[PDB]
Amino acid sequence: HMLRPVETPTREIKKLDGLWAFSLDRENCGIDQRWWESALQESRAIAVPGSFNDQFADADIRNYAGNVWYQREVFIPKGWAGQRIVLRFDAVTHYGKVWVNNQEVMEHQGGYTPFEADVTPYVIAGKSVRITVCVNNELNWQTIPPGMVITDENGKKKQSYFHDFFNYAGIHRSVMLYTTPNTWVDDITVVTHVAQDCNHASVDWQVANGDVSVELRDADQQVVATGQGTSGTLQVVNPHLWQPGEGYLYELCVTAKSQTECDIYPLRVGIRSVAVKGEQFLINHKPFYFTGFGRHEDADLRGKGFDNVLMVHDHALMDWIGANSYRTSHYPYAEEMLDWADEHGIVVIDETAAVGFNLSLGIGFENKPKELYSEEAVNGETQQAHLQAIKELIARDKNHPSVVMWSIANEPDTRPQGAREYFAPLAEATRKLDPTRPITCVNVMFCDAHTDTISDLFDVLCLNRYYGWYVQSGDLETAEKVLEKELLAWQEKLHQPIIITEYGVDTLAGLHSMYTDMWSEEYQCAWLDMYHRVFDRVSAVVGEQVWNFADFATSQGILRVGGNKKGIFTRDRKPKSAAFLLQKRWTGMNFGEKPQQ
Amino acid sequence: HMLRPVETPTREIKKLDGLWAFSLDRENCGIDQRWWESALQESRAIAVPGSFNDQFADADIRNYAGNVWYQREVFIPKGWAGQRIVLRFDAVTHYGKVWVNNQEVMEHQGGYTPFEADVTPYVIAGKSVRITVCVNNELNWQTIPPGMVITDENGKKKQSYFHDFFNYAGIHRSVMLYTTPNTWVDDITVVTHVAQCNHASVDWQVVNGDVSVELRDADQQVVATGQSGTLQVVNWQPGEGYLYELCVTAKSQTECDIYPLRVGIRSVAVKGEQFLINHKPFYFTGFGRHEDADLRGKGFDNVLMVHDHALMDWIGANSYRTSHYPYAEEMLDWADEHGIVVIDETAAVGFNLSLGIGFKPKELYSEEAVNGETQQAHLQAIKELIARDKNHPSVVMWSIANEPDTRPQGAREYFAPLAEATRKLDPTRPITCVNVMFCDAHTDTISDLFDVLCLNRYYGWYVQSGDLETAEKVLEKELLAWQEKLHQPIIITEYGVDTLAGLHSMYTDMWSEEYQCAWLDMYHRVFDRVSAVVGEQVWNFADFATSQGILRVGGNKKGIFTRDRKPKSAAFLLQKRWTGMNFGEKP
Ligand SMILES: CCCCCC[C@@H]1NC[C@@H](O)[C@H](O)[C@H]1C(=O)O
Ligand SMILES: CCCCCC[C@@H]1NC[C@@H](O)[C@H](O)[C@H]1C(=O)O
């Protein structure tokens, strides 16, 4: 049971603020020598939140595999003698184990979701405790995402993985201590139903030794509904709906009264209905059309570290270009992202970190498990770890009205028997963990309409298609034919709504061509344009998401010229020519509505 | 009187949690309608700290001149009923006025220094107060740095100024709320002396409480102790940078307050052709810098500081100049705490009307331009810099201004009071004023009111363009001319050439990486031949944003690094020189 921290009977002191002591451990003696005991040797200042790889311009820190130590002292605020205090890590990429002054208090696997522990017994209010963090950036076959650690003859660990983006690690987001009353709200769940768009209710179901009443206050803070019951309610309402263009928010505030002290938790709600009918995706009983991007949490110097200016600027760009939706590509994003999405009515495809369950999308000319689904590779523990990743993503983003669909994985290889054996239970478990949202699994190119094995276990079909790029390279005529043929094949086979969640081409900013050859800005424009002409001719396609909003870092190889260049913007957010192409189509269309051509 | 908040009896909650409501005021009715009354509407989220220009990819926000509105609520923590609580803005670039629920708690002019006010009478602990800030980015002749606003025919403002870097504005740094005990230290002053194995550290810990001071070590084990005033003997170097800690106890019987403040034991002084740190002949190596970065403008960011310091350490720089304004206080904590030599400078740039582009007041020193009010604001800006960076050991010299025009009559009236007054505002640090190329040896009027004079020279770039043999001859002859003409130590605070990353040439044509390399090598060979100059700082460390014009290809491109911090070929050239010399000792 987890909620995002906020105010009044609750209060934060964040240690996000500032520089920590940081150290490597090339021989992994930190645990043996109990480094959490003393203040570190060999410590250098590092900034949190932020990846550790790019911060020191050193290829050895950058390419490190192992454990790293983050440590900082802090003064525990003194008006906190009688309240309950928690230590919350909003993300520690891959694995983290924390000591609060010689006392292990938490441990976590999963680099993208928050994890907290009550630390009341282990701290002296009014004085300073020392926080030590042990961070592991290693991936094996039971981590979400999977990878393999390669140890050379000399014990240097080098991490290989099967996804594009670079394996940035560290404390990527918020680290804070926050206090709730000893009687406190611990979890909230809100569900919205709507009929003729002027007439429904907000079911609730709450959970910590406190009798609870909930007021549903206005944007004007005018109250229009009231309930009581730990097992919640159905507050019935005639309302203004949370819509894609505007995203209205009521405020449902839950009051947890114990007979002495009280706690109250403010939770914003968007009144909207999501469903799939035939080949139509409907938000509030109207067929929506998705436009926008796959994104990444990547940026210069800070890696995957959260940054407010970046969020403000990237939403300004996305707003300008006319995007209405995005997918949290290949891991759960910072919650600040989803909060922004709620206030602005941005439609979001929420996705777990389950990427790389595929051993066919390689560079060439170089020792893998020859069976993807097996005891050596993706096995039962992997499945359990995956289900737990689904449970953490859902427990954190269930109430967000902007999250409109759950993505279980991205681009697994579905051809082997055992893909369906691995995925079907996860598809079912996910539906039972949130029956109010449709479910998806993003589908790779070579698992075509004929060969794919699991897409009928999901509500929406999300395709990643690169005809004319990785195959039929340079050939816009042939690729157009292939793309039309496979889209009609998919619509014939499943009669589900189709979103093209990935389509894009590597483009060097400033490379121009009078031909329309690959890597050129002219080719990025003509290729996106040919895709758009096809989408507009297939009734089932309800959504387009250009593969990347910006250029991002990847591991080194012959396929990646300083990373992935499929961005519409450069890594410093400057637009390639295709940006204006996109802006013309996406602002020239009626909002949320499929282009009539 | 100023110092940075810390936490043992005092406590901060920073409102730097960035997202504030933000709005323009294009018809300038915000003050009239008292927008601080209600929450701003027609408001959009903005990140604090950070400049407001570049955050929104909007050219109308970017080039705006006027007032902008920043607003955020905060819940004042309830364990704060009896202490004194202050609202601290570490910097609001150019002008700021704060309302804490209607009570206009402050004002500040001067965009690079902090300003704080006690807000206890106007705050109820346990609930949220509404914070409204009005920041103005406009410049006149009475501002630091100076500028002129011209209004076109339709009431549209265009802000013109005379310094290179772009006029970024907004809440550039920390906004923190911090609570002290009701008898509290308000200021600290420390001075260190050292002889040629032993010496003393004066203090003056201006507070309502008796004073006791502990000098704890890095072990925080005691080495001297006192009880306003001291002078203590003992029994901080560039490569290493040690720091002791004096802890101040303001002892009262009603309540107690304590302040921890770091100190560096080192001595700086000049004569002959030598600048000596702890009685040792220094050589400055390093950079002119800027607080500039993508999307955030001049906004402070910790990752940027960690990365840029990794870069300067790798390349072999031991020093930098806080070019054209006072930097982040955290900059100087890093420099003290890492032993970086810092030439500290105020925001006195653009006092010159002579090298703009081609294609205005007709005398610079007069009431129309540089007037008496300008004298006041300049003196006050010098004094705010002095009050905030007085205790920092890394500061090794103070820069009163950068690149004024000294040729018009009257420069010496404006300047003499500021040099006398500033020397009188700290005799423990030497003073300089950076002078432009065209005020050469024969022409310059004021180089003798300062302890060291710092030259910005660009021969072979703006003059003798491409002519590197001829430029060599000029640089050598006027360098020797300066050495004979004042026999002061000389630091070269600026030398660099615009270099487009990826432009390469089999000739050595301007704007090319080969040209930057060849030009820097020729300059370096030139200095190796003048006993007098004790400091080299390549002009800019990274490419930075400027206002638009035919001289600036998407900004200034003189950086050794690009704006995304990638090295040009010259970066390695510099590394070879600065790694190949013995530390602090020039060939
Ligand atoms: C032949 C199949 C090619 C799949 C390649 C498409 C990949 N999908 C996942 C994304 O994270 C990658 O960046 C994308 C790519 O490589 O740019
Ligand atoms: C004839 C030109 C005289 C030198 C003027 C050179 C200028 N000095 C001041 C710095 O702020 C500028 O960045 C520098 C430049 O080039 O960008």
Author numbering:
A (entry chain A): 0 to 206, 208 to 366, 369 to 599
B (entry chain B): 0 to 195, 197 to 207, 209 to 228, 231 to 238, 242 to 365, 370 to 597
What's in the article?
Likewise, C6-hexyl UIFG also was 1770-fold more potent for inhibiting EcGUS than HsGUS. Taking the comparison between EcGUS and HsGUS as an example, the aglycone-binding site of EcGUS is surrounded by five hydrophobic residues, namely Phe365, Leu361, Val446, Met447, and Phe448, which are located in loops 3 and 5, whereas the site of HsGUS is surrounded by Ser485loop 5, Tyr505loop 6, His509loop 6, and Thr599loop 8. The alkyl substituent of the inhibitors therefore facilitated an increase in hydrophobic contacts with nonpolar residues of loops 3 and 5 in EcGUS, e.g., such as Leu361, Phe365 in loop 3, and Val446, Met447, and Phe448 in loop 5. Interestingly, owing to the longer alkyl chains of 3 and 4, Phe448 rotated outward in EcGUS/3 and EcGUS/4 and thus increased the hydrophobic contact area. Similar to the previous trend, the entropy contribution of 3 and 4 increased with the length of alkyl chain (–TΔΔS2–3 = –1.32 kcal mol−1 and –TΔΔS2–4 = −1.34 kcal mol−1 for EcGUS), while the enthalpy contribution decreased (ΔΔH2–3 = +0.04 kcal mol−1 and ΔΔH2–4 = +0.99 kcal mol−1 for EcGUS).
However, intestinal bacterial GUSs cleave the attached glucuronic acid for use as a carbon source, allowing potentially toxic compounds to re-enter the enterohepatic circulation. However, microflora-encoding β-glucuronidases (GUSs) are notorious for reversing the glucuronidation to release SN-38 in the intestinal lumen and thus represent the major cause of undesirable effects. GUS contains a deep enzyme active site (the two catalytic glutamates lie ~12 Å below the protein surface). To understand the underlying structural basis, we prepared C6-propyl, -hexyl, and -nonyl UIFGs (2–4, respectively) and resolved the eight X-ray crystal structures of 1–4 bound to EcGUS or Bifidobacterium dentium GUS (BdGUS).
